[model samples]
Target: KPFVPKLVYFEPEALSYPLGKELYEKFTQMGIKIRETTSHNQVRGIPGETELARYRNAKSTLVVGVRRTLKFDSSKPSAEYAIPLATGCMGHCHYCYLQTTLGSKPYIRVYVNLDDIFAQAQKYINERAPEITRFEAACTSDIVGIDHLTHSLKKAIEFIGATDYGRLRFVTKYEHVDHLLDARHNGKTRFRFSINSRYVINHFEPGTSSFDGRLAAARKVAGAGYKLGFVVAPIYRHEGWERGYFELFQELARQLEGMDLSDLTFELIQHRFTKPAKRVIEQRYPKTRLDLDETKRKYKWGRYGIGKYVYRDEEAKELEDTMRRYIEQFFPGAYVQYFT
Candidate 1:
């Protein structure tokens, strides 16, 4: 039998009170079953006030909300917008940011009010930034894995396909691309796969799809005429890094054989973090096997300006050179989107 989730609700005074019983009726009309009501104290290890603050102003009936587009300049000045459809994720990877953002909550919360999200996003794009080119989904949530439950990505594809926006990037490490196959993407959406070597996926991202599985999904999406991208993001410091990554490149090239390289975008990022965030992660996941070299500062900003938890410049250069050479040799003419 398929696993069914047990829904639980945690409300606190710090957060806004539930709108009314009408909201609950709307939820019932949508076929969502409310399992139980619990106090914030039920969650262990989470600070009372912090939990309360997070739930404060949260509408019980509507889980989806929009954040105004933020000007983010990262190798591109593309205006970015996000829809926080659900707060927490089920995949408990060690290096996940949700550990900090959502604490240790383990239930999936689907936002009952997604129409409002679409309406607001369309209004913003049409009025404020008609010239904006690319838009991304919630950086904080995996829209693909949870799509089977929330159907959020399907709605996103429908919304973006109707718009004149240059491109939309939806990234995931999951192997499920059926949603993409079933949707009418209109070639305007870029289906990005976050891939790594088999070793990295097995060690760092257990429970996620294997590298081959993700690649196959990418191939399927590409075959369906959607623009594809590969993000080698959060490239970690691990043993046999060169051999593993080179093999990954070879496999990627083999998988993408005969596909047009012009539309492909490659993003390479090193694994580095703020000292404080690292400490928090380490403390929360003490058994995590992620390589953490705390001696040097990889980037300019360190925790408290002290040099800790960093990537070396030489190491970064080596990785970039190897990746570039491999891509040039195997998949020539492919645009390397960003190297930072």
Candidate 2:
């Protein structure tokens, strides 16, 4: 059975920052009415009480929006809820969608009303009852990094740990798992680290932690008895990428030695984007070295394809096959989760 989400909630204007303004405008232009809040908070980058107090002083509000009951075949059985913990990010990767999605201005917005958000989530879950089973931490922001200041992810884990309805999944590239480890993660919350080969990390995802750091964090979390997973996402088909990825898998196999691979889930996807999303990415980051035109494929929503560009089906298949072989060799019996 595939994991599915019953309710898809969107905060629209959840973060109270300049980036929020852009997200609001873009979504609105795209025919989405994002709910707005007047809260002052920060997410995933800022730290310390003084900083948090300053954030509180900034005066933040919790804005809630709901899709009631809906389902996406891809994320089935797992309801999706995005809390606007913060808007924008400090890391400036060349291929960031935020550049176009949130405009040129970048200000991190953190939500201090985490308690309220959790309460809202609980209400939604109860009202829906037994159907909605999981809550994905703010899809718009990294929850752990900001946990240092707001402890948002911590609060979320506590809530999920107590609740009987579902599980919580957080996706991030930040390698700081110590905060979460200190909290001693309950089995209810699953941490997924977004990782790729060293080449991708160094070139495409610069400023993000090294692959070793991320893998180390995953190992630590798994060792601590927490449910651990990985997303080898946005897989690119660059020159010599096959060799790079092979080496990466070898390293991963070595690093994960002796660990039970049963709980681990790996996802492989060729990069893809809606036409508008592509345009925005292209316009915002002109200096990006991505070969956007080469990988495009036509879809209902304009042109869609992989990586910062598109590649032929054969290329995608070969890469996917290679990845599968590696995983089968290294983490035998691990679940391979597919998302296209």
**Which is the leading candidate under TM-score?**
1
Colliding residue pairs in candidate 1 = 15-56, 16-57, 298-310
Q: Write the per-residue lDDT of candidate 1 for residues 1-340, one digit (tens) a residue.
A: 1112333342332123232233444445656544333343243322135543333212122232222233322223212555445555545466765555555443445444455666766666776555865667646666676666445677778777888854467678887767668787788788888887767787777556778778888888888888888888677767888888888898888887777667787888777665555766666556878766567445555354444344678878888898888878877777787676
Error of 2 at 215 (Å): 1.7
> What's the true lDDT of residue 15 in model 1?
26
Q: By summed lDDT, which 10 consecutive residues of candidate 2 come out lowest?
A: 1-10
CA lDDT of every candidate = 0.61, 0.59
lDDT by residue (174-217, candidate 2, tens digit) is 77767677563568887888877776777777546668778888
Candidate 1 wrongly placed segments (more than 4 Å)? 1-33, 36-79, 104-107, 128-130, 302-310
